[PDB]
RNA sequence: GUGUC
DNA sequence: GACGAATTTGCGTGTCTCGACACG
DNA sequence: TGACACGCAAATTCGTC
């Protein structure tokens, strides 16, 4: 009786894996036949064979969903900082406070190369760079540390050390990753999205 | 032709064509559907097709 | 207390109509927009059922804000069921002075011959209908209706020159959808849609009215 | 004697069954109304339920009541609500691109033979999907030209 | 004249340029590099791209009909 | 028609 | 009081209803 | 053996002579 009740459920899944293929393949070949000519032009616009405007910007950002880092996002700023913090260590460079970190960041950001992307990404990175500075002041007044740079305890300056040389490479790397995260002009978005709901 | 008993080839259906379309390659899609399967040279007229 | 609920349903549709005329571009002050229940009770009595507050008493004359020599009416048929001459009397009632634009807030179901005769004459006078059951909630401020703004022609020309396309290329929208009938826009106008989001920001989209 | 019970005394006739759901939190309590019907414009245009915050499941009902631009949002949440209970992962852009394919015309279309006949414009393409004779004979009768692209 | 297109070299154009160069070199074409002893001109076609010595101009067409000329040496190759 | 994925 | 016009609803019919390989 | 989009058609109501 237990073997019969166990093999009853085994036939429940064996008849289910035989029928899924039919209507699944039917819905797949019905979904591909409608979305197979949707392409992205060179002016960041998706159109069909006629020339009609489907969407002014694919998704809203013009980014390939495949090349993304973090649940929908271009890249994670904390992880890239955690990487660049240890790959370029040089104790010769001293530390700095937050009120100078903000001015250095906004001075190095106002350059001739950085004025090519969306200012939304710039505000998104300004929200993260500002939040890192609030973490530094609480740790600095945590134990008691003057930022002038002369205090005989030497290890208290190694808790969260941010130097101006490694902060430029972080910005350049994230800005360059945001350049490659953009979807290429000419990709077939219709055929790509048609099969994403297939499997 | 169909079958190995007559020394035939393989079939390239639509689901495998969708994989080549999603990538975006047009040279290979035309090479293994028109150049290697059936390449014919026909003639027509301009006055009346 | 049923007439109390009827007066509440009537105040709701009156406030929605006022908000619609305010968003369209007509000039109305705030206290008429933001009127409370007791503030409405001092202008119009509640009891009896539909006595002192007749439907003919509900006939609002709004003035166009940018163009002075322009006035619009909006009124309620006294009758539950609409007829043919019952609309023509109200048409020739406000046709007599200088008026061209009026709105009908229909109470219950509509007569097809009436709407056919309506769509018969539109060289000079345009009359548009609205169901009372339909105008009991704000449509733009509901939950997920993106902010729509009807644009001008001096802007659509530079929009066409921006992307180098034609009006046919622009996505078309219907003329009978509740939003278009709300804003009252037929063929030959582009609407801007602001799609909000708190991930990156808000996006801009353009649509054509068909 | 057979239709007196059939005659309703109050309510919405096509509205069938309603249940109240209790949603709790740390110290918070809400009562949400679940209506099993289609007439959204009628269940929202009442005194009790809040008319601004009320959503439906049928795409056609929200299309005819709210509008076409508001129907493209309820179809994105509908698809995403079906994918999160399965343990699958799709990105928002794949759904947003498909939701704009059946809305740029002006009408909410479906991916069938009749919808594809209305959205696209190619003869031999439409013939290579469903019935060939009908499309070919219609093209021969009309006699239009087709630029193969 | 100002360019309104991204400067990064697409893989779609990279592949087609590589294919065109591979097909042309196999046509007894003058090589733009001193190649090592090695067959399969496809293998050496990437060598010219890595050294930016490919005389090919990419013409990008816009939906309206605008033509944009770009050089393979001017494009940025990233990998 | 049978057999496998 | 009686006749032409337009609306809503029960009922008639056509099309498919994933791929691949091998053998008799 | 499910899917509903097309026509085809009869019961019925507002209207005006
Ligand atoms: Zn000839």
From Swiss-Prot, chain A:
Effect of residue 59 to R: In WDRTS; uncertain significance
Coiled-coil zones: none
Superkingdom as given in the UniProt entry: Eukaryota
Annotated stretches, region: Bridging helix: 1-40
Subcellular location: Nucleus; Cytoplasm, Cytosol
Expression by tissue: Expressed in the brain, in the cortex and the white matter (at protein level).
Free-text function comment from the UniProt entry: Catalytic core component of RNA polymerase III (Pol III), a DNA-dependent RNA polymerase which synthesizes small non-coding RNAs using the four ribonucleoside triphosphates as substrates. Synthesizes 5S rRNA, snRNAs, tRNAs and miRNAs from at least 500 distinct genomic loci. Pol III-mediated transcription cycle proceeds through transcription initiation, transcription elongation and transcription termination stages. During transcription initiation, Pol III is recruited to DNA promoters type I, II or III with the help of general transcription factors and other specific initiation factors.
Family per similarity comment: Belongs to the RNA polymerase beta' chain family.
Name the UniProt record assigns to this protein: DNA-directed RNA polymerase III subunit RPC1
Organism per entry: Homo sapiens (Human)
Lineage, broadest ranks: Eukaryota, Metazoa, Chordata, Craniata, Vertebrata
Gene: POLR3A
Residues shown, of full length: 845 to 1043 of 1390
Swiss-Prot record, chain B:
Location in the cell: Nucleus; Cytoplasm, Cytosol
Binding residue positions for DNA template strand: 4-5, 11
Effect ascribed to mutating residue 11 to H: In CMT1I; affects RNA polymerase III assembly; no effect on nuclear localization
Assigned protein family: Belongs to the RNA polymerase beta chain family.
Quaternary data: Component of the RNA polymerase III (Pol III) complex consisting of 17 subunits: a ten-subunit catalytic core composed of POLR3A/RPC1, POLR3B/RPC2, POLR1C/RPAC1, POLR1D/RPAC2, POLR3K/RPC10, POLR2E/RPABC1, POLR2F/RPABC2, POLR2H/RPABC3, POLR2K/RPABC4 and POLR2L/RPABC5; a mobile stalk composed of two subunits POLR3H/RPC8 and CRCP/RPC9, protruding from the core and functioning primarily in transcription initiation; and additional subunits homologous to general transcription factors of the RNA polymerase II machinery, POLR3C/RPC3-POLR3F/RPC6-POLR3G/RPC7 heterotrimer required for transcription initiation and POLR3D/RPC4-POLR3E/RPC5 heterodimer involved in both transcription initiation and termination.
Name used for this protein in its record: DNA-directed RNA polymerase III subunit RPC2
Annotated organism of origin: Homo sapiens (Human)
Gene designation: POLR3B
Covered residues, full protein: 1036 to 1084 of 1133
From Swiss-Prot, chain C:
Function: DNA-dependent RNA polymerase catalyzes the transcription of DNA into RNA using the four ribonucleoside triphosphates as substrates. Common component of RNA polymerases I, II and III which synthesize ribosomal RNA precursors, mRNA precursors and many functional non-coding RNAs, and small RNAs, such as 5S rRNA and tRNAs, respectively. Pol II is the central component of the basal RNA polymerase II transcription machinery. Pols are composed of mobile elements that move relative to each other.
List of residues that carry N-acetylmethionine: 1
UniProt xrefs under InterPro entries: Arch_Rpo5/euc_Rpb5 (IPR014381), RNA_pol_Rpb5_N (IPR005571), RNA_pol_Rpb5_N_sf (IPR036710), RNA_pol_subH/Rpb5_C (IPR000783), RNA_pol_subH/Rpb5_CS (IPR020608), RPB5-like_sf (IPR035913)
NCBIfam families: PRK09570.1
UniProt keyword Nucleus present: yes
Protein name, entry field: DNA-directed RNA polymerases I, II, and III subunit RPABC1
Gene that encodes it: POLR2E
Organism: Homo sapiens
Family: Belongs to the archaeal Rpo5/eukaryotic RPB5 RNA polymerase subunit family.
Record keywords, A-Z: Acetylation, DNA-directed RNA polymerase, Host-virus interaction, Isopeptide bond, Nucleus, Transcription, Ubl conjugation
MF-aspect GO terms: DNA binding; DNA-directed RNA polymerase activity
Swiss-Prot record, chain E:
Main location: nucleus
Top-level taxon: Eukaryota
Disulfide pattern: none
UniProt subcellular location: Nucleus; Nucleus, Nucleolus
Keyword entries, A-Z: Acetylation, DNA-directed RNA polymerase, Nucleus, Phosphoprotein, Transcription
GO MF terms, alphabetically ordered: DNA binding; DNA-directed RNA polymerase activity
GO cellular component, one term: RNA polymerase II, core complex
Biological processes annotated in GO: transcription by RNA polymerase I; transcription by RNA polymerase II; tRNA transcription by RNA polymerase III
Subunit description: Component of the RNA polymerase I (Pol I), RNA polymerase II (Pol II) and RNA polymerase III (Pol III) complexes consisting of at least 13, 12 and 17 subunits, respectively. Pol I complex consists of a ten-subunit catalytic core composed of POLR1A/RPA1, POLR1B/RPA2, POLR1C/RPAC1, POLR1D/RPAC2, POLR1H/RPA12, POLR2E/RPABC1, POLR2F/RPABC2, POLR2H/RPABC3, POLR2K/RPABC4 and POLR2L/RPABC5; a mobile stalk subunit POLR1F/RPA43 protruding from the core and additional subunits homologous to general transcription factors POLR1E/RPA49 and POLR1G/RPA34.
Family designation: Belongs to the archaeal Rpo6/eukaryotic RPB6 RNA polymerase subunit family.
Protein's UniProt name: DNA-directed RNA polymerases I, II, and III subunit RPABC2
Gene: POLR2F
Shown residues within the full chain: 49 to 127 of 127
